[PDB]
């Protein structure tokens, strides 16, 4: 299978990037520091759960968009895309191989960070039951890898459209700024400026249009704690959906964007 050949090239290409290594080391040391702060303040479990969720939300889209902002537009202007099209390959094989390689890099970074944090929690806090810790941290790695794959597909969509790498970097910066900061500030301004009198039924349903809030709604299901620890995500308690609908919505956010990236890459010539 040529998909594994493209993925084997992409793994060794992406593991030699130094910005990725620096940001993954920063993520690991920040997760260790947040775990040590939670252990020192320990019951402070929802505070450190929300802090780890916010750290992963701020850092893992950055890792995915730094990996895949030049996957298609960097091959086309590098002259190797036409060469690969003359090789016995399709376009779905190239896209699937790049997605598999970058997803393996994302899963490796997630596993390193949330293994270091779990080891720090296990060594620091005495008498901690492993039945909650293993379940919560496994949910953390699975949802973090899903969020990274969401932004990988976003980067593939934004890279298959442009014809220059600088515009791809600008669109990646705009995508990172829009989904992380701008959407929550827009929702907060809509809630504050209307005092909760602007469509009270439809407003909790707008949280499903941002994957970075579905991630925190997944990871704040077990330990709500206090109502001030979420801000706008206190609107998520009014959602009548069960817990698996958020997982299905994250999978749909992967799939729809991957199909759109395949359509754009197929049309592009």
């Amino acid at each position: 299978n040529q998909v594994w050949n493209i993925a084997r090239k992409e793994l060794s290409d992406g593991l030699r990037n130094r910005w990725l290594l620096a940001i993954s080391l920063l993520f690991a040391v920040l997760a260790v520091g947040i775990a040590w702060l939670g252990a020192a303040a320990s019951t402070s479990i929802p505070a450190t759960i929300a802090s780890l969720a916010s750290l992963a939300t701020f850092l893992m889209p950055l890792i995915a968009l730094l990996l895949a902002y030049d996957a298609i537009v960097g091959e086309d202007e590098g002259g190797t895309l036409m060469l690969l099209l003359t090789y016995p390959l399709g376009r779905g094989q190239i896209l699937l191989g790049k997605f598999v390689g970058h997803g393996l890099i994302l899963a490796l970074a997630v596993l390193i960070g949330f293994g270091c944090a779990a080891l720090a929690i296990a060594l620091l806090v005495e008498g901690v039951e492993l039945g909650m810790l293993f379940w919560a941290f496994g949910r953390f790695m699975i949802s973090s890898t899903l969020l990274g794959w969401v932004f990988l597909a976003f980067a593939y969509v934004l890279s298959g459209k442009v014809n220059e790498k600088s515009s791809a970097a600008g669109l990646a910066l705009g995508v990172w700024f829009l989904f992380v900061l701008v959407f929550d500030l827009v929702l907060l301004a809509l809630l504050v400026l209307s005092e909760g009198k602007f469509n009270p039924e439809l407003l909790p349903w707008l949280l499903l249009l941002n994957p970075t809030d579905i991630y925190r709604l997944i990871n704040l299901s077990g330990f709500e704690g206090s109502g001030s620890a979420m801000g706008v995500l206190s609107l998520g308690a009014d959602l009548p959906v069960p817990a698996a609908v958020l997982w299905l919505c994250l999978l749909a956010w992967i799939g729809v964007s991957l199909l759109l990236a395949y359509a754009i890459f197929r049309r592009r010539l």
């Binding site: 090239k9 002259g79 190797t80 099209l85 003359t86 390959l89």
Partner: protein
């Protein structure tokens, strides 16, 4: 036959790009493609490579359809400007391309000793010059056992020695049954290694054939110069009896232009009287034939001191 393009009239919508191109490539030929106006050469490139589907006619590469795996494992393509992956090394890029083409990995060693990259197989591609990247592109082009090479400017940035050695390797490959298509804008330099030339203008194919049949079809003046001639005053007028204009630029650098129909009597006149030093029999080269065939398709010479 290797390439059997028949009746292709490829269009980009409301305008006609290619118009009734009938090109038959044999086995062991180093036929070259020339042309600068219009996208006639590039559309033919993508038609042979299978990147473009013909709107009319049929393209047959190596007997089969040009988008099959069995003809894409037997085809070598060297593009114009390939940057490659700057973080990978020389061995890893060639191993990746050999795994993609399904070739053997041991050849990855031999090809790296075949062009120039035995010493620099461990350094990254970001520390490579233009000629080194051309060597790497040739090395991935010769992967496996290709039966049709489609090189696009193979000697841009290369050595004056490696150019000669690349053409020697191309002659070795054409002596074993492979067929090469050379595209280049440097017409002096490829005219000593091709077997056929195809000139394209305004989408149409103006002339095809060998370099002797092109000179037979195109009546052009032969530009013979007898440098170091013994006598020049009667050499100004002894060639003009049969219509060969005798124009000189130095003490003895006279470029007599003939009519290509009286070559025996001019050589008899040159050899019976007067002793020469180094006669340059300047036949009409590929540049002059290209100029004539662009003029025949409709063109005007630029003014003095222009372009």
């Amino acid at each position: 036959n290797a390439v059997e393009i028949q009746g292709v009239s490829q269009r980009y919508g409301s305008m006609t790009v290619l118009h009734d191109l009938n090109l038959n490539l044999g086995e062991g030929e180093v036929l070259g493609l020339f042309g600068h106006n219009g996208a006639g050469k590039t559309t033919s490139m993508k038609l042979i490579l299978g990147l473009l589907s013909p709107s009319e006619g049929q393209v047959k590469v190596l007997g089969r359809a040009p988008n099959d795996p069995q003809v894409r494992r037997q085809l070598g393509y060297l593009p114009e400007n390939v940057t490659f992956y700057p973080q990978l090394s020389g061995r890893e890029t060639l191993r990746h391309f050999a795994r993609l083409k399904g070739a053997a990995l041991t050849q990855v060693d031999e090809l790296l000793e075949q062009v120039g990259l035995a010493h620099a197989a461990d350094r990254r591609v970001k520390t490579y010059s233009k000629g080194m990247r051309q060597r790497l592109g040739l090395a991935q082009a010769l992967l496996g056992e290709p039966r049709l090479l489609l090189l696009d400017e193979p000697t841009v940035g290369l050595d004056p020695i490696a150019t000669q050695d690349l053409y020697l390797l191309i002659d070795r490959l054409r002596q074993r049954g492979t067929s090469i298509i050379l595209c280049s804008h440097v017409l002096p330099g490829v005219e000593a290694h091709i077997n056929r030339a195809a000139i394209l203008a305004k989408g149409c194919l103006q002339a095809v054939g060998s370099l002797s049949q092109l000179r037979a079809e195109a009546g052009l003046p032969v530009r013979i110069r007898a440098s170091g001639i013994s006598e020049r005053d009667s050499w100004l007028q002894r060639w003009t009896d049969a219509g060969h204009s005798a124009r000189g630029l130095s003490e003895s650098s006279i470029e007599v232009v003939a009519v290509n129909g009286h070559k025996l009597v001019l050589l008899r006149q040159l050899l019976g009287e007067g002793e020469p030093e180094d006669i340059e029999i300047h036949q009409p080269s590929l540049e002059d034939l290209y100029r004539y065939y662009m003029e025949r398709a409709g063109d005007v010479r630029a003014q003095e001191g222009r372009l």
